[PDB]
């Protein structure tokens, strides 16, 4: 019932490059609309009635096409343009959205800034003890983390979380949280956070002791 | 793509919707005027002779407004022993069923050369096409010969739902060779210097060329495809138009096809503002929707200016188009909406 | 300021009636369409349907024909979307947005969770350790989503990295880091302000060396 197909489903580009995604409709539609969205945020209108730039939208952008084909072109890709873009048809109910073109950015590689943190007095006085480890602003995405308790590896209770590209530096970051018991924790002394990344063969190691 | 057979041969159009002013017999009744049909005694044939007086006719009710772009006629074949047919005919159409209009082509000719034998199907390109609900065929006879018809209507549904548009008469620019930017085919009234109660070039599905002086049609004057006005004729600084629709609708957008050959005076409108009325009250639905166009634009090619209408529900529209250059040239105006 | 303010979170037991709100302001409410778009995390967008206040005209997506019902109190300038019998998949983020074609304004969206589990505020733990320092904030054990986090009341916006929450034992854990010049902390105060709509919690926590 008029579903839109966007290509590429996912694509990356280098700064200053001329990006350009596509929206194909199973059927003809008088206009196409484009919205932009960044993780954990509301979509914003980007373009309406095929080619009009929604308020606040930078000049770099444009749109066009007709019938069943349509496209969103970016003159000169900047860092902030990194997001997922959805096209929408409003010529027939149900007004469906496309699959969305996820646009990732390209940039120089960057090593990660690791930071380890000892469970606080507040959590401990509750029988709990978490150890956090921040590896911020690194490129590319691919990164591996390792936890150690007294020279030995540990993988029980370790939770990870990532973030997509930063709109300013275009890097990634992740947070690992090794959670134990006040007891399970007060029975060892050397907790370590290791992380290998293509910017270095030797894993980056941060660590603290009591 | 607006040339679908509307239902005669097809059967979509029911007998009830096909009347006439008289049948010779019941074997030649309106219901037998379906193209390519053998029902009855071959076709429809007027009762009285179509003498110098030309009042006999066949009538087809399409029920909903349609953009009829073509018609096909036939004679009474009847097995092969039929020998009667209409050599020529006139057309009259209607939208409200009370006010009829005569169809006349771009070159002022009313008569349509019809058939040459009973069998064959002669098609006619209605230029300009007609937006109608009801269509009448007035068989023509130049001598006392027994005429008969069998018809077909081609076109498509009139989804815009525009019943009529009011607007200032088209002016003319004296430029080397006079350019006439008047609404040539307006099928309404034109009292004073104002057109009303009808439809014309701005709603015929034809879009003008980049160079407004030359057209796609033949044997027409310079500027034919457009309807333009000059800034100096309107102290207010904008052209105003009022549009009336078939029913209450939610307006998504309005699309104006304009000439941007600024080299000769034509530039896109500076901005567009429209007011909405749903019908009853004598007041406007709310604050108007003013849309400005980014800038003046470099290239002279005609473009389609698209105005967002917020989906505002209404049945009457009153838009204004701000001049941005000496003149303003439009060749078409379309509305994108949904019936509520 | 066109605004479509709507609740951050909404929780209900499966099969139970739930009603999401959206209060508009900044323009003639009665003559604009109010739409509702549904989105499950990291997935696409789905248009549920809209309603035009002045007239009561509606448009439903067949798909939610028997799941939702739009209404509007043309008195408080609010628009509602009803869900008759909630079912996990019927739990995601719901956005109300104005417009007919050009959806020009969007609300913050409501995170709707269909669950028998009870609401639990979060426990916020500070994270203390050369040119710059990196402080942290650990938000552990809350339900349901979402949780907001700002540093120094939004004063610190640069160098912040708030990570997506994770589950384990039907409870969420969130983490947030901030990086400031070593010459601003500890000489200046760096406070973590966490918020949990579902439990109406606004907790501040200074990071002490
Ligand atoms: C639209 O403008 C044209 C201007 O040419 C009108 O057509 C002319 O009408 C006069 C009046 O008899 C003729 O002498 C001219 O020869 C016509 N133009 C041609 C063929 O050169 C036309 O009538 C106008 N349409 C209306 C009804 O306003
Ligand atoms: C439409 O015509 C008016 C009146 O001739 C134009 O306004 C005048 O423009 C001249 C120079 O172009 C100025 O010196 C006058 O002060 C203006 N008179 C007024 C309005 O008080 C107007 O520019 C024309 N429209 C456009 C945009 O071409
Ligand atoms: Ca036209
Ligand atoms: Ca003309």
Number of CB pairs < 8 Å for A and C? 121
Token pair listed for B117:
């034998």
Contact C177 A90 (CB under 8 A): no
According to the entry, how was the structure determined?
X-ray
Ligand 4 midpoint to CA B201 (Å): 7
User: Rounded to the nearest 5 degrees, what angle is found at the Cα of A57, between the Cα atoms of A56 and A59?
Assistant: 120
Ligand 2 within 6 A of CB of B323 = yes
Paired sense of beta strands A101-105 and A10-13, if any? parallel
Half-sphere CA count of B300, side-chain side, radius 13 A: 10
Token pair listed for B266:
């034509």
Look up the CATH architecture of domain A1-107.
Sandwich (2.60)
Ligand in closest contact with the CA of B208: 3
Resolution in A: 2.8
How far is residue A82 from each of residues A1, A64, A170, B212, measured CA to CA in Å? Answer: 30, 20, 8, 43
Residue located nearest, by CA, to atom 3 of ligand 2: B232
Which of helix, strand or coil describes residue A79? Answer: helix
Contact A31 B308 (CB under 8 A): no
Instruction: Name where chain C breaks: residue before each gap, C-N > 2.5 Å.
Output: 129
Which residues have a Cβ under 8 Å from the Cβ of C122 and sit 6 or more positions away? C139, C140, C141, C142, C147, C172, C174, C194, C196, C199, C201, C203
Ligand 4 midpoint to CA B171 (Å): 9
Specify the CATH superfamily of domain C1-116: Immunoglobulins (2.60.40.10)
Closest CA to B297 of B272, B273, B269: B269
Q: Where are the domains of chain B?
A: 1-159, 160-340
B208 with B302: CB under 8 angstroms?
yes
| Residues B278-308: b if buried by 16+ CB within 10 A, e if exposed | beeeeeebbeebebebeeeeeebebbebbbb
> Which residues of chain A does C4 touch, with a Cβ-Cβ cutoff of 8 Å?
none
**3-state SS record for B46-108:** CCCCCCCCCCCCEEEEEEEEEEEEEEEEECECHHHCCCECCCEEEEEEECCCCCEEECCCCCC
Top-level class of domain A108-210? mainly beta
Task: Give the mutation target among B171, B230, B237 for probing the ligand 2 site: most ligand atoms within 8 A of CB.
Answer: B237
Nearest-angstrom CA–CA distance, B294 and B27:
66
Residue located nearest, by CA, to atom 8 of ligand 2: B232
Token pair listed for C108:
């913050």
Ligand 1 within 6 A of CB of B201 = no
Measure in Å the smallest separation between the Cα of A133 and chain C Cα atoms.
10
Q: What is the CA radius of gyration of chain B?
A: 23
**Binding site residue list of B for Ca(2+):** 182, 201, 204, 206, 224, 226, 331-332
Nearest atom in ligand 2 to the alpha carbon of residue B231 is 1
The two domains B1-159 and B160-340 share their CATH topology (first three levels equal)? yes
Residue in C closest to B336 by C-alpha: C101
Task: Report chain A residues touching chain B, CB-CB < 8 A.
Answer: 30-31, 48-52, 90-91
Measure in Å the smallest separation between the Cα of C50 and chain A Cα atoms.
11
Give the DSSP letter string of C105-131: EE---EEEEE-SSPPB--EEEEE----
Measure in Å the smallest separation between the Cα of B55 and chain A Cα atoms.
44
Ligand 3 midpoint to CA B292 (Å): 23
Q: Which fold has domain B1-159?
A: Jelly Rolls (2.60.120)
A18 with A1: CB under 8 angstroms?
no
Ligand 1 midpoint to CA C36 (Å): 54
Contact A93 C59 (CB under 8 A): yes
For the domain with range B160-340, which CATH number is right: 3.65.10.10, 3.40.50.10470, 2.60.120.1190, 1.10.10.1100? Answer: 2.60.120.1190
Nearest-angstrom CA–CA distance, C149 and C163:
10
Nearest-angstrom CA–CA distance, C60 and C83:
13
> Which residues of chain A does C36 touch, with a Cβ-Cβ cutoff of 8 Å?
none
Closest CA to B270 of B244, B242, B236: B236
Nearest-angstrom CA–CA distance, C122 and A120:
15
Q: Which chains touch B (3 or more CB pairs under 8 A)?
A: A, C
Contact A90 B252 (CB under 8 A): yes
Residue located nearest, by CA, to atom 26 of ligand 2: B325
Give the DSSP letter string of B3-62: -EE-STTTS-S-GGGEEES--SSGGG-GGG-BTT--TTTSSB--SS---SS----EEEEE
How far is residue B57 from each of residues B64, B110, B137, B240, B309, measured CA to CA in Å? Answer: 21, 15, 5, 39, 43
The domain made up of C117-209 is a member of CATH 2.60.40.10:
yes
Q: How many residues does chain B have?
A: 340
Edge-to-edge strands, sheet with A153-154 = A153-154, A144-149, A190-197, A200-209
**Residue that the structure tokens 């009022």 belong to:** B242
Choose the closest CB to A132 out of C106, C162, C175: C175
Ligand in closest contact with the CA of B128: 3
Closest CA to B313 of C60, C52, C2: C52
């Amino acid at each position: 019932d008029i579903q839109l197909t966007q290509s590429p489903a996912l694509m990356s580009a280098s700064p200053g490059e001329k990006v350009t995604m596509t929206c194909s409709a199973s059927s003809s539609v008088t206009f196409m609309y484009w919205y932009q969205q960044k993780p954990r945020s509301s979509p914003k209108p980007w373009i309406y009635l095929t080619s009009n730039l929604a308020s606040g939208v930078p000049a770099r952008f444009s749109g066009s096409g007709s019938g069943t084909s349509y496209s969103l072109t970016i003159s000169s890709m900047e860092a902030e343009d990194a997001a997922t873009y959805y096209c929408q048809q409003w010529s027939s109910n149900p007004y469906t959205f496309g699959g969305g073109t996820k646009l990732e950015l390209k940039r120089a590689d960057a090593a990660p800034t690791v930071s380890i943190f000892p469970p606080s007095s507040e959590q401990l006085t509750s029988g709990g003890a978490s150890v956090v480890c921040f590896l911020n602003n690194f490129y590319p995405k691919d990164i591996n983390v390792k936890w150690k308790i007294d020279g030995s590896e540990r993988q029980n209770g370790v939770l990870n979380s990532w973030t997509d590209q930063d709109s300013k530096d275009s890097t990634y970051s992740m947070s690992s949280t090794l959670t134990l018991t006040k007891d399970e924790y007060e029975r060892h002394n050397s907790y370590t956070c290791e992380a290998t990344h293509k910017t270095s063969t030797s894993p980056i190691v941060k660590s603290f002791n009591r | 793509k607006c040339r679908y057979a509307l239902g005669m041969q097809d059967r979509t159009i029911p007998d009830s919707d096909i009347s006439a002013s008289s049948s010779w017999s019941d074997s030649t009744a309106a219901r037998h005027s379906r193209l390519e049909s053998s029902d009855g005694d071959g076709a429809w044939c007027p009762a009285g002779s179509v003498f110098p007086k030309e009042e006999e006719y066949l009538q087809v009710d399409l029920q909903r407004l349609h953009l009829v772009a073509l018609v096909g006629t036939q004679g009474r074949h009847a097995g092969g022993l039929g020998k009667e047919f209409s050599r020529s005919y006139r057309l009259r159409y209607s939208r409200d069923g009370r006010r009829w209009m005569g169809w006349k082509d771009r070159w002022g000719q009313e008569v349509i050369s019809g058939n040459e034998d009973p069998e064959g199907v002669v098609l006619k390109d209605l230029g300009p096409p007609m937006v109608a609900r009801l269509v009448r065929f007035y068989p023509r006879a130049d001598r006392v010969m027994s005429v008969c018809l069998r018809v077909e209507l081609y076109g498509c549904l009139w989804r815009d739902g525009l019943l009529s548009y009011t607007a200032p008469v088209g002016q003319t620019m004296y430029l080397s060779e006079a350019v006439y930017l008047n609404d040539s085919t307006y099928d309404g009234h034109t009292v004073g210097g104002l057109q009303y109660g009808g439809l014309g070039q701005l709603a015929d599905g034809v879009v003008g060329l980049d160079d407004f002086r030359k057209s796609q049609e033949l044997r027409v004057w310079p500027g034919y495809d457009y309807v333009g006005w000059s800034n100096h004729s309107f102290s207010s600084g904008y052209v105003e138009m009022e549009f009336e629709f078939d029913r209450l609708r939610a307006f998504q957008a309005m699309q104006v096809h304009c000439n941007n050959m600024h080299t000769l005076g034509a530039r896109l409108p500076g901005g567009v503002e429209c007011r909405f009325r749903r019908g009853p009250a004598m007041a406007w639905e709310g604050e108007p929707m003013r849309h400005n166009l980014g800038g003046n634009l470099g290239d002279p090619r005609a473009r389609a200016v698209s105005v967002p209408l917020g989906g505002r529900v209404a049945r009457f529209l009153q838009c204004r188009f701000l001049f941005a250059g000496p003149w303003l040239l439009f060749s078409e105006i379309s509305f994108i909406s949904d019936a509520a | 300021q066109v605004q479509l303010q709507e609740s951050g979170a909404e929780l209900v037991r499966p099969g139970a009636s739930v009603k999401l709100s959206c209060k508009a302001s900044g323009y003639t409410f009665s003559i604009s369409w109010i739409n509702w778009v549904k989105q499950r995390p990291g997935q696409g967008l789905e248009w549920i349907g809209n309603i035009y206040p002045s007239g009561g005209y509606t448009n439903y997506n067949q798909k939610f024909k028997d799941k939702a019902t739009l209404t509007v109190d043309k008195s408080s300038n609010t628009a509602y979307i009803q869900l008759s019998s909630p079912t996990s998949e019927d739990s995601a983020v719901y956005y109300c947005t104005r417009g007919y074609g050009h959806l020009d304004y969007w609300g913050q969206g409501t995170t709707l969770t269909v669950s028998a589990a009870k609401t639990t505020p979060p426990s916020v733990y500070p994270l203390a350790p050369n040119s710059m320092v990196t402080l942290g904030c650990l938000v552990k054990g809350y339900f349901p989503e979402p949780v907001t986090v700002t540093w120094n009341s939004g004063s610190l916006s640069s160098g912040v990295h708030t990570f997506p929450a994770v589950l384990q034992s039907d409870l969420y854990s969130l983490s947030s880091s901030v990086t400031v010049p070593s010459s601003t902390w500890p000489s200046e105060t760096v406070t973590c302000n966490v918020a949990h709509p579902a439990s109406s919690t606004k907790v501040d926590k200074k990071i002490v060396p």
